[PDB]
């Protein structure tokens, strides 16, 4: 029974329409610009004006849940306004993962098939435990393949033995958590890597990442 919020600081329309297929019972475009608000409104969207003063989608969602009075317990699925494609079915998966795996933040990943993105700092790497509980997210390749990378010359000699995972920009969290998230001070960790999800891990909170 989730609600979708798309942080949007036409690309957005695709996220928007992919969102509609998700089964979301509400899809809001979160923006900080009149031009985006109007454009968003032009494709039949509920819009929420937010301030410029947010360094992350999660942070912007916090204001959105306040302004709209989204009840604490409502499940919010942040679908970053830059998402390539989302089999909408997955969105329902992550949302239900909150209670399935007993966590305040659920997310998703995809099996990496090209090794060149292992080493791309804009391709965020994620790695979990046996149940999908995240160990760490990084712009650096994780895990490290000592035997293949130690004095590695060709990215194409690299054998990705189903070890690698690329993080997708979709979060599932109840409004109340987004409020808590932003009640935490920004971390050095999230700020070095520029990855909002690292505030949850740093605050001793766990994250679930589904394949």
Ligand X SMILES: Nc1ccn([C@@H]2O[C@H](COP(=O)(O)O[C@@]3(C(=O)O)C[C@@H](O)[C@@H](O)[C@@H]([C@H](O)CO)O3)[C@@H](O)[C@H]2O)c(=O)n1
**Rounded to whole angstroms, how far apart are CA atoms 84 and 168?**
9
The first and second tokens of residue 196, run together, are 């909002």
If one asks whether residue 45 binds ligand X (CB under 6 A), the answer comes out as: no
- Tell me how far, at minimum, the Cβ of 11 lies from ligand X, in Å: 9
Closest among 72, 56, 99 to 3, alpha carbons compared: 72
Task: Determine the number of helices (DSSP H) and then strands (DSSP E) in the chain.
Answer: 8, 9
The residue behind tokens 């204001």 is 63
If one asks whether residue 193 binds ligand X (CB under 6 A), the answer comes out as: no
Closest among 148, 167, 169, 9 to 83, alpha carbons compared: 169
The 110-149 site mask, x for binding ligand X (CB under 6 A), equals: --------------x-------------------------
Q: Using the rule CB under 6 A, which residue among 3, 5, 19, 56 binds ligand X?
A: 56
If one asks whether residue 169 binds ligand X (CB under 6 A), the answer comes out as: yes
Helix (H, G, I), strand (E, B) or coil at 157: coil
If one asks whether residue 14 binds ligand X (CB under 6 A), the answer comes out as: no
Piece of 6-14, 21-29, 67-75, 203-211 that binds ligand X (CB under 6 A): 6-14
| Spatial contact of 58 and 171, defined as CB atoms under 8 Å apart | yes
Closer by beta carbon to ligand X, 158 or else 209: 209
Piece of 79-87, 155-163, 181-189, 200-208 that binds ligand X (CB under 6 A): 79-87
The first and second tokens of residue 5, run together, are 């919020």
Closer by beta carbon to ligand X, 107 or else 174: 107
In 82-174, which residue ranges form alpha helices assigned H by DSSP? 88-100, 146-149
- Binding region for ligand X (CB under 6 A): 7-9, 54-57, 60, 80-82, 124, 167, 169, 194-197
């Amino acid at each position: 029974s989730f609600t979708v919020i798309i942080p949007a600081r036409p690309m957005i329309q695709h996220v928007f329409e992919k969102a509609l297929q998700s089964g979301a019972s509400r899809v809001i475009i979160a923006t900080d610009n009149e031009n985006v608000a109007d454009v968003a409104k032009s494709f039949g969207a509920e819009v929420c004006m937010t301030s410029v003063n947010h360094n992350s989608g999660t942070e912007r969602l916090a204001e959105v849940v306040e302004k709209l009075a989204i009840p604490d317990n409502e499940i919010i699925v942040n679908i970053q306004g830059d998402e390539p494609l989302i089999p909408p079915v997955i969105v329902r998966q992550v949302a239900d993962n909150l209670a399935k795996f007993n966590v305040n933040m659920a997310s998703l990943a995809v099996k990496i098939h090209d090794a060149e993105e292992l080493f791309n700092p804009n391709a965020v790497k994620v790695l979990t435990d046996k149940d999908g509980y995240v160990l760490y997210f990084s712009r650096s390749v994780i895990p490290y393949d000592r035997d293949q990378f130690m004095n590695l010359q060709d990215v194409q000699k690299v054998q990705l033995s189903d070890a690698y995972l690329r993080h997708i920009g979709i979060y599932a969290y109840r409004a109340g958590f987004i409020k808590q998230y932003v009640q935490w001070a920004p971390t050095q960790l999230e700020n070095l890597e520029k990855l909002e999800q690292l505030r949850v891990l740093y605050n001793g909170e766990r994250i679930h990442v589904e394949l």
